[PDB]
Structures are given as structure tokens and as C-alpha cells.
Amino acid sequence: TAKKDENFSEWYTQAIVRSEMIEYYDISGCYIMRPWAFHIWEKVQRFFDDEIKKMGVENSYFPMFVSRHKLEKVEGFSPEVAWVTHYGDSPLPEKIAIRPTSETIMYPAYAKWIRSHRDLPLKLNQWCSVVRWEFKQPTPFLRTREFLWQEGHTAHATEEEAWELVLDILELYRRWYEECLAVPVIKGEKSEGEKFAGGKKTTTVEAFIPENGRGIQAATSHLLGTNFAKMFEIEFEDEEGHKRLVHQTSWGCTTRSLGVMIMTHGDDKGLVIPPRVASVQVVIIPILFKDENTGEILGKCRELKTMLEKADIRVRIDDRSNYTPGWKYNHWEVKGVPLRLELGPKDLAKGTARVVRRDTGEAYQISWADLAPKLLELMEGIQRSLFEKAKARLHEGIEKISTFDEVMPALNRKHLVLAPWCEDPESEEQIKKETQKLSEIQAGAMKTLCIPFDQPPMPEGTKCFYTGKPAKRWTLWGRSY
């Protein structure tokens, strides 16, 4: 009912409801991931895990609790600590905390495990859930009490090796978004005001939501440097016998990616799932009505399913008798299955099937023998087309500007701005506050999204679009999630 361009958050809520991706729950901010959503997580998890295993990153599991004494005697997703005080009706002798971060457990372990240069590099990953206690206005995948992620943490003898890993991981995050989810992203560096607190440098991939003009951070990969090694005394004796601090990285990516995929590819009809991650790629809809199944149509449906599955196509036959074919068409459209295969009496009488693409609605009459190759072709086409259209929208959403008087216009067009910036942090705070004020008066704030790796030329003497001081680099700004 709600149109994506007119009432975006209503559209998002409804499209997620009707798609059966999630279910509600009696504790606020929590959402059940049903298979239609969880399978997408499984796909990107397998891709990213295969790739980091090639880099020698090994998975691990740390306890979810920290002792009161370890906390009393690192910035997390919650400012305060959640305490477990009882088991059943019995008070614990000492209350324990749900860990605010994994770093508080992992880094003391790293300080024990690393003693010598022979022990480096150390590369660990953990797939797990994460809890937040101070979410506001929850919404599936974007603002939740609990989400899923992977977090990698590595330690190296040199900063050069650590940085190399940071960038390799950022490239894997680009591939996670662009090759699996068909979502284009922009590689860049965070501002001093937006990077990880105690780290040296934060790199990020950023996406864009045209319907509200907002940038959204897709994933991050931090050069932590030696600051945490000094805090946690993670030292190694080098080849010459001198004690040195390790150079660390950490990197994470969450189920927020599913939300970004949803928002990127949905239309007024509902979700559109990229074929590479869809739980079902082709739904076979028999043109049947209740109490009339002779076996002719369902038998051919089953033969077609077998044939498609031998080409590794994920197929479901919706043979539920109590629904009309048109009901099923709309049901699977709203889920965003990328292809629908229609088989009725006429198709049986002709040796063909009618196949409809979800992204464009185009229909193809395809002989049974041709189904498996043609479908593979179509799915790649759909995947590619989903990405390129999104990429086009991304580039139409960014305006390259020179001066501050160009900001509020572009923000009113629901656009990001790429502007020469002196990178002075106080100026980012000033720009946020005054774009926020301006927005208020006009009826919010605009902040740095990233400093892109891809830098256009900077003419000699170009001045900062805000302070008028010498500009350092081109910086991508916008309203933000």
C-alpha cells in the first residue's frame, strides 16, 4: 500500500512485514529472523568466511560474560553494563556483566598469547550476536536490541602489514555488498571525529539511500595502531630482543547489510532479492484450483524442479490449494523472489513455461528443454541489472560543490555533497550544528560520511568549502543514519 518514494519508513515496515523476513517478539527491539532473511545472512556469511579463511583468519568463540572484578580493576554498543545477578531465584555470589565489548576479553588473551615475533601475525574472527541496550525507535535490521555480525581482530609486528590487512578486509566488504547484495558502496576514510575512538585510522564502505537522501555506513575496518597494545600490554620481543608493541586491526559487518539491501532494491510492490542470496531463486506456481489436482500439472512441476536443481537453482513449488494463482503471484512478488515460473494447462499443452522477472516484470515463454540455461542467464542479468541501476542512482545522488552556499540546496534535493575540506575537526562539529539549525529554521544535521579513496584532482590553492582555509581532500558529506 505505502509507496517507497512517498512514505519510505512506512514502505520499509510494510515490505518487511509482508515478505515474512522477520517476526515480532515480546521484548522490545528484538526481531526473529525467519529463513527468508536468515538465508541471506547464511550466504554472505559463507562468502566472507571463505575469503577470510584464505587470509589465514581463524574463527573462535569468547564467553559473553565479564566479571565485576575485571571491569572494576573500550567503547561498546552501550554506555553502561547489563548485569546478571541471579540464577533462578538464587542471587549469584558476585554479579556478572554481559561483556560491553569483545576487546575487554580478547585483548588480555592476546597479551598472554603473544610473546615473540614468532607469534605474529595473530588473526582471529568471531561470528556472534551483539546486544544494545539504548536503541531508539527500533526497526528491523537498522535499530535493534540484538543483531548478528562478525568481528575480526588481528595483531601484527608492523603497521604496514596491519594496514595491508585493513584494506584487504575493506575490499572483502566491498565484495560482500557489491557482488552478493548488488549494493554499490564507496570506500573511504572516516573523519577524525567519526573514526573509532582509540584507533589510528578507520576505513569504511558507505552506501546511499536515495528515498531519504541519507548515507549509511555499510561496514568498517580499523587500523587500531598501538594504542590498545599499550593499554593491554600486548608486547612482543623482536628479532633483536627488544620489546615492541603489536599493531592491531579490527573489523566488523552486521545484519544491517540486509536492511541496506532491502532499501536499495525494493520497489512499490515489495522486496526484490538479488538471485545470489535469495533463499528461493525460482518459484514454480502451478495454475491450479482446489480439489482439481489430476497430477498432470504438479507432475511436470516436479520434473521441472528436479531439472532446475541439477543446475544448482534453488526452487520451490507453491502447490498450496487454498490460494488462487494470482494470490501466489502477489505473495511471491512481495517476498521478492527473483523469478516466477508459471505452469498451467496451456503451458503443458505447448511444452513451454511462462517466466517472469521480479525486477522489471518482463515475461518469457521458454521451452522446457531451455529452462535451465535461460534461467541461469536471467538470474545473472537480474543480479547485474540490480547493481548497475543502484550504482546509477548512487552517482546521481552526489553533487560536487565548492562553497557552503551550495550545501542546503543539495541537501534539499536529498543528495550528498562532495566538497573540498580542510579536515579540521572543530569545523565538522560547526558544520553539523549549523546545517542542523538551518534545517530547523527551514521547516537534520549533515556530517562527514567518508573521505573517499577515489580522490578527484585538487587544484592548487582550493579552499575549504566551509572555513575558507586551504582544502586538504575531497570529503563526502550528507544527512546520515
Add this chain to the structure above:
Amino acid sequence: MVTAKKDENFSEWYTQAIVRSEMIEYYDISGCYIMRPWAFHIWEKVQRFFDDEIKKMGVENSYFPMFVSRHKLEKESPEVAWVTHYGDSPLPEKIAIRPTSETIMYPAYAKWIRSHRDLPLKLNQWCSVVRWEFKQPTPFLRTREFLWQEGHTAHATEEEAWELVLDILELYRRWYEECLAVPVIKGEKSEGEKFAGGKKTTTVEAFIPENGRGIQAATSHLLGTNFAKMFEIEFEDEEGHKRLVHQTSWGCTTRSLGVMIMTHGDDKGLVIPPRVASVQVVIIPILFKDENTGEILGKCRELKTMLEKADIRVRIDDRSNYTPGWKYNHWEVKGVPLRLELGPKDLAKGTARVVRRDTGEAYQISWADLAPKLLELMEGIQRSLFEKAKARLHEGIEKISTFDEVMPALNRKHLVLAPWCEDPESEEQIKKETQKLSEIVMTGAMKTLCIPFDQPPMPEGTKCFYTGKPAKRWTLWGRSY
């Protein structure tokens, strides 16, 4: 290197084996442990096995919240861990961390299921849960937080549910026997030992000879219609009458790793069955006094490529900061099944020296014969580990007929197979009497482990070994985890 002997101080041996093989890091909070990458590799092998198999059965993965409300939890709790505070302030309502997810998932099941067309519903989750007991913990075997999978299905009939119960139990037998080379006994739990709220619990039970204790390896419950009544999970059948669903739930945990360690470990540390070894063959180049250094490394990489063509999992330990003898000890204590040594002598002869971990036997193998001979050796090692463990299991069970045989058999560190009337009060009586007699860290009580599927014949008039009433079935008892 391990120095405690498995048959002398079993607990010290076990701690040494799991720490020196880099599987476990002990932790500030008792009963919680850091699971290091070497352990996580084995977990990932059995996880992949079981996940692939349940996908063939149509079970889909999902993710439900880690928290559960007081009212859902108690519609149904001394192991449940309560979050009661955030910072210094009480939560308005305490919430529980999941010890299991029946009460989390089944309100959603009742919402989702309306028609016989909605069945069977088959969901699974891979996650961690928390059971905060104060009895003695053991890394892997009995912990306060652990990784597991939990599957939950709903069916139109009891018979279909029971088929799935038994199919999953067979997958747990394969998990232990086929992957981990650990023999298990299928049975049903006694009325007193079955899952609370369920109808019938089936189990696979393992045995640890060094301390004489049985342990439940995995469990598969027929929940029946009991939880369907609790949560109003109903469907309209084909005739239009409302019926309760018939449910199953099943789980298996990282306990499986503990049982593998204890089953196959020896005085030198771990022994990993080839089917779950992430490194099946470690290649050790013998570099001494610069003799053929480049040639040896090249031939090692060639041999790695050749072996990977046969799907053998190979690692070259060409780390320069360790001697060959160090690498021998390192990969032995970590339990790599096969070690391949290549030095100048081996290069000259066109062979390699291969040492199998379980027996220490050495082989001189031509390069051309390496892949078929190593495949044969690995299947021989796998089968031999299983057969030796199965022999120890058989020797650890005494078949008895009267209660005065119980304490001697328990004192030989054995289980007992006894005819039992299956009256539930007699199990409490037997636990208490055997505890008292044990006196004259873990409990000395003998409880039922399972009523085996495999039933010896019950001669007419056989008396229950404890009550003297007519025996019903043969029952396996022991001290237990």
C-alpha cells in the same frame, strides 16, 4: 608437551591436553572458557556435516532472540540467568538469557501455523545458550555457556514427528561415530530423566572409561502435543477440524569435542580423527645446515598440490623460527593425524617419511604412491580409533541381575546393564542409596543413562534388580556427567 599420564591423573591430563594443544584458554568466570581456533576447526567440521544433512531433510536455519520474558519463560527455572540491572538502575522487568528456545520460538510457531498446508514446519538455529549451574564444570563437557544447534519441528501427526526424532538421532550417531570416531548407545531416557514438558526423549550415550562416567552425547525429543497445548499451536486439518501439532526438538553441543578428546587422547596429547582434522597431513621440511633448502621447499609445495588433488587437507609448516623437532612435537600435541617429513635424504630417494599419530608407525612412501597410500592410512586411522573406543565401551559395561552387584561394578569404573521395572520412584531411591554407599568431586550416585533401543530378551519372570518387581526392560545405569 603433555606430561601427565592419562591413566594416572585423568583431570590433570585433560587440562594439559586441552591447554597445550591450544584448544582452550581458561577464564576468570568459572565454567566459561575461551574456545581457541584449533578447537573451533573441529566444531566447524561437525557443524558443516550436520547442517548439510538437516538441509537435505528440509530444515532451514533461522535466528531467534537470546532474551526471553518472564511470562513466556514461566508459562512453561534455577539454571536461567536473569538480567536485572543496567548500570546502577534495575530494569523495569527482568529478562532471562536463553537456556533453550522452546518458549522463545513457539509463540511464533502458534502465529505461523494455521493449516495442514503449513506443516511440517522445520527450523534450526546455531547459537550459544547459558545454563548457570554450580556443580563442577568441565571444559567442553559441562559448561555454563556453550555452542549448539537446536532444531524444532512441528508435524500434522505423531508418527511423522517420531520419524523425524529418530532420523535426527541417527544423524547424532553419525556425528559421533562417523565424524568423531566415538561410539554411542541409542536409547530412551527414563521418565525422570526426560526433557521437562516432553513426551519421550531419545538419546545417544557415551562413556569415559578413565572415570567410569556415562555422558549424554546428544538428545532428540518427541515433545508430542504438550508444548502445542501450552502455546496453542493448532492447525485446521483437511476435514476442517482444529488439531494440535506434534512437535520435536533436538540439540547437540561442543560437548562432542570434549568427548572426542577424552576418547582418543593419549599421553602425548590430542589425537584428531582424520574426518574432522582441519590439517590431515602436516609437511615438515627438514632444513639443517643449508642443505638443499630451496629444493626441499619446492618439493614440499609440489607434494601439497598433489595431495590436495585428492582432497587431502595439507599444511606445510615452513615456519623458519622453529626447529623440525619443535614442529614434530607441536603437531603431535595438537593431534594432526599424519606427519610427512622431507629432508635431503628423502629428496634423494624420491620418497617421504610419514608417521601416523595414533600409533607412531612410520612409513617410507614413494611420491607417486603418496595420495592413495595416505587416503588408505587416514581411513585406517579413523576406523582403528573407532574400533578401539568401541572395544573399551563394551568392556566398560557389566550386565547384572541383582543390586548387590552394583557397587563392585561401579568401583571397577563400569556401567551396569540391569533389568528394571521402570518405576520412577525407584530411580530416586537408587541414586540416593548408591550415593550413600559411594561414601562408605562429582556425585557418586548412579542414575539411568538410557533404556537402550537394543534390548536383550527379557526371560519370563525376570525380577527388577532393585525392587524385585517384574522387570520391564534392560536399562543402562552409571555414574554420570
